Amino acid sequence: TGAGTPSQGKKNTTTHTKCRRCGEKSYHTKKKVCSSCGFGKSAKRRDYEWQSKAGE
Amino acid sequence: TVLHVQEIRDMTPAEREAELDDLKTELLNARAVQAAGGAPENPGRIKELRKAIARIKTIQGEEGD
């Protein structure tokens, strides 16, 4: 079975969903953790210095 | 417009409530006529009714009821 088109047919699983805390469609309903704002993982908001250039 | 602030402050606490219920009903009956597509409307009132209710409520808060 090809890893391409033929394997795309089984993708009918819902994982990332609208997040209660940030509004982005990143709340993983299986993990119950938002990949965008960290909701479900930390009280503090997910953020990293690498999200922008070092001198900015 | 028709209902001024003085007039509201001159009302008794019980008169504002009665007046409130009166206004809420004119409002509900207007929104009903609107829902039925009824055009015998006068767009200014449905808009005025909302402000009147806001005023009365503001005064009720101000006067302690």
Binding site: - | L28, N29, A32, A35, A36
Partner: protein
């Protein structure tokens, strides 16, 4: 504070329920229960509510189909508004 009844739901289907089954239809606050819809309606129009059916619509609002007792006449109640 939110009110229970928003406005009468007037559509062809609503009329049939009114003429043929003595029912009134309303757009009501989606936080309202059948019991709250029942009371609010009796108090606003002074009638006796026999049964209430509800639905959360694809319009974001809640629709309530309220049947009145044989003592009251839907057409008449609706006609005064």
């Amino acid at each position: 504070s939110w009110d229970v009844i928003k406005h009468p739901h007037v559509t062809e289907k609503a009329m049939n329920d009114m003429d043929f089954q003595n029912k009134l239809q309303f757009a009501v606050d989606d936080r309202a229960s059948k019991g709250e819809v029942a009371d609010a309606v009796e108090e606003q129009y002074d009638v006796t509510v026999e049964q209430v059916n509800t639905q959360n619509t694809m319009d974001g609002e809640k629709k309530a189909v309220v049947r009145l007792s044989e003592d009251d006449d839907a057409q008449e109640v609706a006609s005064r508004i």
